[PDB]
Amino acid sequence: ADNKFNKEQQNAFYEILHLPNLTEEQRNGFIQSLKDDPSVSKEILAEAKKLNDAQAPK
């Protein structure tokens, strides 16, 4: 089994890598979830974006 990312999973991994307002604990947890099972990428990305947006500088 070849486990190189589909587009979909890649765009989510990079997004998560680069969301600016996550703490590294938070980021690492989301990345670990995608490592574990890349098929949950959609849901994990949506959570990560919510959390990023909630923590934006104001």
Ligand SMILES: [Zn+2]
């Ligand atoms: Zn940052």
Ligand SMILES: [Zn+2]
């Ligand atoms: Zn302000």
